[PDB]
Amino acid sequence: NSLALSLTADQMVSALLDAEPPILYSEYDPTRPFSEASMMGLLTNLADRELVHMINWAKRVPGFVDLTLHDQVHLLECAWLEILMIGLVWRSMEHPGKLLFAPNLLLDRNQGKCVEGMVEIFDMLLATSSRFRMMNLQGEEFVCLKSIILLNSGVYTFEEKDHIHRVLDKITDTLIHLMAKAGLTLQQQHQRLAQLLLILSHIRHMSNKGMEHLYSMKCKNVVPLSDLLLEMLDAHR
Amino acid sequence: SLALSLTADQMVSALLDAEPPILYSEYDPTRPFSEASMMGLLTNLADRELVHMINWAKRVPGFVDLTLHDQVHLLECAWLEILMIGLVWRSMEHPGKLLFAPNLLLDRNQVEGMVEIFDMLLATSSRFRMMNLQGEEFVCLKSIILLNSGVYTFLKSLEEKDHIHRVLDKITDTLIHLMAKAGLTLQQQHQRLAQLLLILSHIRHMSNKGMEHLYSMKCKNPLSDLLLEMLDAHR
Amino acid sequence: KILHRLLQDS
Amino acid sequence: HKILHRLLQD
Ligand SMILES: CC(C)=CCn1nc2c(C(F)(F)F)cccc2c1-c1ccc(O)cc1O
Ligand SMILES: CC(C)=CCn1nc2c(C(F)(F)F)cccc2c1-c1ccc(O)cc1O
């Protein structure tokens, strides 16, 4: 029996909020990246450090620790880029037209154009960001969504499955709880719930497109990829 | 428009009535088939389904209200997702098998690095089965994909995006209406709604993986002119 | 464009 | 033997 299912809605929220990874910085340098090398250099370095925080974050997601080590590995291998991207989109919410990879690294689509096949992904991220903004997405909602991605994205590529789906149900309850607390009507609740979960389909799309692009520069040998990033990437092929 | 004014039961009736037919394949049990031959069957079958899908999309409430260029984009983005959820729905009552056609039932044991996609389609089918997905819910999910999958890859065009979101909220209302009529509690309705919509994330994943495999098959050289154009849209 | 054509048929 | 295997333990 998992502790996750015995948690109340507010306990679930507080657990996720406190498990939140910090916002990392990129290297301090006013040199705005335009070359493919320098931009991807800054992005890989950042992604690599964020991955270590993500791993220790995932272990603090209720129900994740009850999974076998292998299942934990599979879910992270499947979801990591989605988790990075929705984080990026969340951080960039209050910066319209901008992507806040780090507080000292604000990228616009003009810089995305300066790598081949990147601007389309930039535009999708920017659209998701403005979408988050027009919905007035809250932090409590954000952490629920990120947890959903972690548990859902690799669940159909597998009784620990029923466990994941019970935990998934628990998060749904938590999302509804947050909307009820925010004063939303019953109709507004299931409409907003649906709106949030449909964006996950787009997040999945961006991750898949990104994964293709990362495989290219990996085969290109453009930019130095760490062994950890290489292993996460190989899991998708 | 006519879409926004429809009741929930009217939405369901409109969608059920707009359902495309289930086509047959040219599969011959006695004929030997290579990987190229089996693919020929699937490509040919999908190509004929696309024609029905296009006419089906025009009877999805709200879709016709959209500009022609936006109708093209949504179909270009979602066509493989719609085919796949169609396949998964028809395969619901056939565990371990995929019913491409009434005369074409394949298992996992049948080729060219598509087994991974097969197993994902099989898992989704098994998921629908354990959830006991209803036809009224399926047609709603399929219409959601059509309207949602390409809505964020769209300067006066923002009004178009708002209209699509309104219709999407109607379909959500319709889904809830169905689950409430089935006697589900409030908590059960929201949970089931969430479960159904998370499946769309997996359906998007399968489509993207499928589109990758389609690109390589093209460069290997048997695709119709329509399929070729639909494939180029993603690249 | 085939898709563009099949859509506008009536 | 994956790095992720090790990182999920510490
Ligand atoms: C190898 C790397 C840097 C993976 C992370 N990554 N990849 C990205 C691409 C792609 F190269 F795939 F097209 C586009 C936009 C953001 C991308 C990120 C990324 C996302 C979030 C984040 O906090 C940091 C990142 O580098
Ligand atoms: C070029 C073709 C056959 C596109 C449609 N398509 N592609 C598929 C693949 C892939 F080739 F991508 F790996 C795997 C499984 C089913 C696939 C289908 C398909 C789906 C539903 C349907 O009713 C008919 C199909 O051929």
Side-chain angles (χ1 to χ4, degrees), chain B residues 92-96 98-107 110-111 113-115 117-124:
Chain B
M92 234 190 72
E93 318 93 308
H94 307 274
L98 293 172
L99 194 141
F100 288 91
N103 60 1
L104 191 56
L105 192 66
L106 296 81
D107 50 42
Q110 55 190 156
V111 285
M114 182 191 285
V115 57
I117 299 185
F118 260 52
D119 278 22
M120 296 187 301
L121 290 166
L122 288 176
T124 310

Side-chain angles (χ1 to χ4, degrees), chain B residues 39 42-43 45-46 49 79-80 83-84 87 90 100 114 117-118 121 209-211 213-214 217 223 227:
Chain B
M39 276 303 99
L42 268 59
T43 59
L45 173 59
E49 286 187 281
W79 67 273
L80 190 58
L83 284 183
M84 284 179 165
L87 172 62
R90 302 191 303 268
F100 288 91
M114 182 191 285
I117 299 185
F118 260 52
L121 290 166
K209 278 297 174 179
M211 215 67 66
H213 193 265
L214 258 52
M217 279 170 47
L223 301 174
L227 279 173

Side-chain angles (χ1 to χ4, degrees), chain A residues 127 131 152-153 156 165 169 172-173 176 187 190-191 194-195 197-198 201-202 204-205 208-209 212 236, chain B residues 123 127 148-149 152 165 169 172-173 176 187 190-191 194-195 197 201-202 204-205 208-209 212 234:
Chain A
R131 177 55 175 175
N152 176 64
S153 290
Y156 295 148
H165 289 83
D169 288 343
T172 300
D173 300 341
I176 291 300
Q187 185 179 31
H190 65 243
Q191 284 188 356
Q195 288 164 9
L197 298 176
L198 286 183
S201 169
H202 291 274
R204 174 87 80 157
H205 191 66
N208 291 327
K209 296 270 92 182
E212 299 172 8
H236 288 261
Chain B
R127 176 56 172 174
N148 174 69
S149 287
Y152 296 141
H165 287 108
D169 290 328
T172 299
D173 297 340
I176 293 293
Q187 182 182 31
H190 297 155
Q191 285 176 356
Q195 296 157 356
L197 295 184
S201 161
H202 294 268
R204 176 86 80 148
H205 182 78
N208 284 327
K209 278 297 174 179
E212 259 194 313
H234 282 79

Side-chain angles (χ1 to χ4, degrees), chain A residues 193-219 221-223:
Chain A
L193 174 65
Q195 288 164 9
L196 289 180
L197 298 176
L198 286 183
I199 298 177
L200 263 40
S201 169
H202 291 274
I203 293 177
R204 174 87 80 157
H205 191 66
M206 294 188 293
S207 170
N208 291 327
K209 296 270 92 182
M211 211 67 74
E212 299 172 8
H213 188 254
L214 299 183
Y215 162 80
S216 299
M217 76 172 182
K218 179 256 180 298
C219 190
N221 200 28
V222 190
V223 47

Side-chain angles (χ1 to χ4, degrees), chain B residues 1 3-34 36-96 98-107 110-111 113-115 117-154 157-158 160 162-180 182-214 216-219 221-234:
Chain B
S1 71
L4 297 182
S5 56
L6 295 180
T7 76
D9 289 293
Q10 288 173 348
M11 173 72 69
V12 176
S13 300
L15 290 182
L16 291 181
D17 191 42
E19 275 295 271
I22 302 177
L23 305 183
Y24 285 82
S25 66
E26 302 151 314
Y27 173 72
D28 191 345
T30 63
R31 182 172 301 266
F33 286 80
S34 56
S37 299
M38 293 307 303
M39 276 303 99
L41 297 181
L42 268 59
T43 59
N44 180 280
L45 173 59
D47 175 73
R48 279 175 294 121
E49 286 187 281
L50 265 178
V51 187
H52 292 278
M53 184 198 300
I54 290 169
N55 296 267
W56 158 86
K58 301 163 74 171
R59 300 178 55 178
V60 171
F63 188 80
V64 163
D65 301 316
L66 272 53
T67 70
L68 181 275
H69 284 358
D70 289 340
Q71 296 176 15
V72 163
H73 176 70
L74 292 182
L75 273 174
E76 280 178 350
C77 286
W79 67 273
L80 190 58
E81 280 186 78
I82 295 180
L83 284 183
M84 284 179 165
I85 195 183
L87 172 62
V88 170
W89 167 249
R90 302 191 303 268
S91 308
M92 234 190 72
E93 318 93 308
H94 307 274
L98 293 172
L99 194 141
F100 288 91
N103 60 1
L104 191 56
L105 192 66
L106 296 81
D107 50 42
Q110 55 190 156
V111 285
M114 182 191 285
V115 57
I117 299 185
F118 260 52
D119 278 22
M120 296 187 301
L121 290 166
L122 288 176
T124 310
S125 183
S126 177
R127 176 56 172 174
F128 284 179
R129 197 182 311 114
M130 81 180 71
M131 293 187 67
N132 190 22
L133 180 68
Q134 299 298 296
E136 299 83 350
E137 300 178 308
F138 158 73
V139 292
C140 285
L141 288 181
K142 197 166 61 174
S143 289
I144 287 165
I145 291 172
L146 177 63
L147 302 172
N148 174 69
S149 287
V151 79
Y152 296 141
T153 41
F154 272 143
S157 63
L158 282 176
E160 303 305 304
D162 293 337
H163 177 67
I164 304 181
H165 287 108
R166 289 182 180 91
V167 183
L168 280 172
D169 290 328
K170 302 294 293 187
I171 304 171
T172 299
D173 297 340
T174 305
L175 276 177
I176 293 293
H177 169 83
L178 292 170
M179 303 176 194
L184 274 64
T185 62
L186 256 299
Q187 182 182 31
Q188 287 175 338
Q189 292 170 52
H190 297 155
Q191 285 176 356
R192 169 167 269 260
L193 177 65
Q195 296 157 356
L196 290 181
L197 295 184
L198 288 190
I199 295 174
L200 268 45
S201 161
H202 294 268
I203 287 173
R204 176 86 80 148
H205 182 78
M206 291 188 296
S207 171
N208 284 327
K209 278 297 174 179
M211 215 67 66
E212 259 194 313
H213 193 265
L214 258 52
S216 58
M217 279 170 47
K218 178 195 184 308
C219 299
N221 186 266
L223 301 174
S224 66
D225 289 334
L226 179 57
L227 279 173
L228 290 168
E229 291 187 359
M230 303 296 287
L231 180 59
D232 273 336
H234 282 79

